[PDB]
């Protein structure tokens, strides 16, 4: 699957910006906090696992919420509605078989109605102006993974997990583009497992170096170290699974030598 490879990357690189959330958005949200968002995102991971939905779908949802919240005030009491509608749309976009609306009502233990979820769905489509093909940390990762010598599943799964980790903490990751996060996640995965660095083929491809990833890498390396004590555990729980080669069990490195 190339051709194309470069064109698409170039294209996602541009949409990345076009699609980035507002970095400060949470400061402007009277009734909600990064902390509650984390809960939402964590909840969505659980759901993702529950329904066996693509990681991409999870990544799409969070892009939606963050974009939606970048321009719509929401009361804590409705933040979850925004969450499900986001997941529903993500599902409808990405999934071969999206869960039916009822299922999303049901996973809130009936906190909203099919009618609320649908009406929230419209709102979100209105607020995003149907702009749903968002580049994701995951999208960039699957590209980066192609530059591995040779392919390694623990690396692939560990980047996923790490990338997925970042979705939870608006502060700081909200300030880094999906390709940059995917850079940190990828290299951190490769180092941890193999003791290898960010590939020069990827420098050629991305124009990123360890130099440029560093800031994010520093943040990602902390999230990795502080992962077992994080308030939210659904992602580590998820990545205990054999499906993901139990990568959340592998030990974070003590240092990076950067």
């Amino acid at each position: 699957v190339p051709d194309y490879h470069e064109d698409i990357h170039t294209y996602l690189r541009e949409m990345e910006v076009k699609c980035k959330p507002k970095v400060g958005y949470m400061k402007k949200q009277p009734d909600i906090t990064n902390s509650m968002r984390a809960i939402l995102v964590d909840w969505l991971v659980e759901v993702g696992e529950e329904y066996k939905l693509q990681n991409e779908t999870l990544h799409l949802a969070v892009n939606y919420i963050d974009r939606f919240l970048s321009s719509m005030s929401v009361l804590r009491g409705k933040l979850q509605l925004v969450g499900t509608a986001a997941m529903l749309l993500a599902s409808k976009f990405e999934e071969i078989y999206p869960p039916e609306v009822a299922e999303f009502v049901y996973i809130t233990d009936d906190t909203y109605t099919k009618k609320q979820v649908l009406r929230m769905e419209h709102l979100v489509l209105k607020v995003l102006t149907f702009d749903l093909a968002a580049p994701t940390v995951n999208q960039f990762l699957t590209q980066y993974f192609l530059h591995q010598q040779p392919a390694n599943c623990k690396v692939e799964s560990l980047a996923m997990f790490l990338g997925e980790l970042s979705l939870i903490d608006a502060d700081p990751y909200l300030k880094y583009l999906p390709s940059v996060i995917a850079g940190a996640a990828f290299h951190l995965a490769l180092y941890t497992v193999t003791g290898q660095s960010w590939p020069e083929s990827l420098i050629r491809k991305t124009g990123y170096t360890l130099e440029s990833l560093k800031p994010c890498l520093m943040d990602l390396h902390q999230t990795y170290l502080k992962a077992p004590q994080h308030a939210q555990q659904s992602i580590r729980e998820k990545y205990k699974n054999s499906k993901y080669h139990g990568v959340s069990l592998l030990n974070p490195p003590e240092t990076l030598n950067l």
């Binding site: 051709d3 649908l118 702009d131 192609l146």
Partner: protein
């Protein structure tokens, strides 16, 4: 919103609803209105529509049908497309005694490949390239339309829907139950369409998956591990397949003059890998002298 438009006549579909030739009262612009019935729709906005709209927004190209606006009442969803006069199928039936002139065929294929290259460059598979979804204008333009079945893909692709591409135009990889399919499926569809514009008949008008397979195999030869590594390994490969010799390709599409044969040959390669890409195809000697003339209606 809908105030500005005045319906003229319906023309086609759905599901979704009907497509509507309509005139912008204020600007003059003649448009196509895809009305998409909601009323809560029990399931909200169809994934089809959602994809159609989101992908179409990102696809701004002279040979991709232009979504001009989404009109968004809480009861109905209205899609405003640039109006194009007919579809390629319709046009081919009109040509079904004169024939379609060679310069028009080149022009049309060339444009198709442009819009297709563009889609593929933007990580979008069309996944339903058939003459009925290729719209022509009076000016000589042909445009990919109906992004109902399209899909944003990642690199590399993962697994997407299998019930994909109208049978006559469905690539062997899909027929043989491939785990992963890619851009090569749209090229396949185009290769068929290319034969179709020449022969004015479908290349492989099968009425089931296995029939389709066998139709293809009879024309291009039953693939083996030499022509298509991993075939005999695919989920719906049966060793019991009749094993046909590949026809002399001058016989598949007799009037095609040798540059075309080459091109088609590479569009219809069994191996999605080896199968030419929209991008590469544009450079083909077949198009060395392409213009983009007006059709004859």
């Amino acid at each position: 919103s809908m105030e500005n438009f005045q319906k003229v006549e319906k023309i086609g579909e759905g599901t979704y609803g009907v497509v509507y030739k309509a005139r912008n009262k204020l600007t003059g612009e003649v448009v196509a209105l895809k009305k998409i019935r909601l009323d809560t729709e029990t399931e909200g906005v169809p994934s089809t529509a959602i994809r159609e709209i989101s992908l179409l927004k990102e696809l701004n190209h002279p040979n991709i049908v232009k979504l001009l606006d989404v009109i968004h009442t809480e009861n109905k969803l209205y899609l405003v497309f640039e109006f194009l006069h007919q579809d390629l199928k319709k046009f081919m039936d009109a040509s079904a005694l004169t024939g379609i002139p060679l310069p028009l065929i080149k022009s049309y294929l060339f444009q198709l490949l442009q819009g297709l290259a563009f889609c593929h460059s933007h990580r979008v598979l069309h996944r339903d390239l058939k003459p009925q979804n290729l719209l022509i204008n009076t000016e000589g333009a042909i445009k990919l339309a109906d992004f109902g079945l399209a899909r944003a893909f990642g690199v590399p692709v993962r697994t997407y829907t299998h019930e994909v591409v109208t049978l006559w135009y469905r690539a062997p990889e899909i027929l043989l139950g491939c785990k992963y399919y890619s851009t090569a499926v749209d090229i396949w569809s185009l290769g068929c369409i290319f034969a179709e514009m020449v022969t004015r008949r479908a290349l492989f008008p099968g009425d089931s998956e296995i029939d389709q397979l066998f139709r293809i195999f009879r024309t291009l030869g039953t693939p083996d591990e030499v022509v298509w590594p991993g075939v005999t390994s695919m989920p719906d490969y049966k060793p019991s397949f009749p094993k046909w010799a590949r026809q002399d390709f001058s016989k598949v599409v007799p009037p095609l003059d040798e540059d075309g044969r080459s091109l088609l040959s590479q569009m219809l390669h069994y191996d999605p890998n080896k199968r030419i890409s929209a991008k590469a195809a544009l450079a083909h000697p077949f198009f060395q002298d392409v213009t983009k003339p007006v059709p004859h209606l």
